[PDB]
């Protein structure tokens, strides 16, 4: 006449536990910017006249 179907009292096993400890790490910072030439010389003339060659 029945007298069965008891629910399983689960312990919630197999839990994925990892403990953590103190540790020193260096911190970083990403910055946006542009590259630039180390030495750029634009050629300007020091006289007047026609460019022959």
């Amino acid at each position: 006449c029945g007298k069965s179907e008891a629910p399983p009292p689960a312990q919630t096993p197999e839990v994925g536990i990892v403990t953590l400890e103190a540790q020193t790490v260096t911190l970083n910072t990403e910055l946006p910017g542009r590259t630039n030439a180390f030495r750029i010389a634009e050629v300007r003339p020091q006289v007047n006249g026609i460019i022959l060659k």
Binding site: L31, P32, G33, R34
Partner: protein, 50 residues
């Protein structure tokens, strides 16, 4: 805004962003403790108990 030399300003400093409420007008307490609710009005021509 972003200038072409890489300089920039974002929506992080000039404002603070938080997932807050939409309307802070009305709020509810139940026996002193903070809560919230929704009152339901029954439809016109409908039984109450069912």
């Amino acid at each position: 805004k972003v200038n072409p030399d890489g300089s920039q300003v974002r929506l992080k400093d000039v404002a603070d962003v938080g997932l807050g409420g939409q309307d802070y007008s009305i709020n509810a307490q139940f026996n002193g403790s903070p809560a919230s609710g929704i009152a339901i009005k029954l439809a016109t021509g409908a039984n109450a108990l069912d």
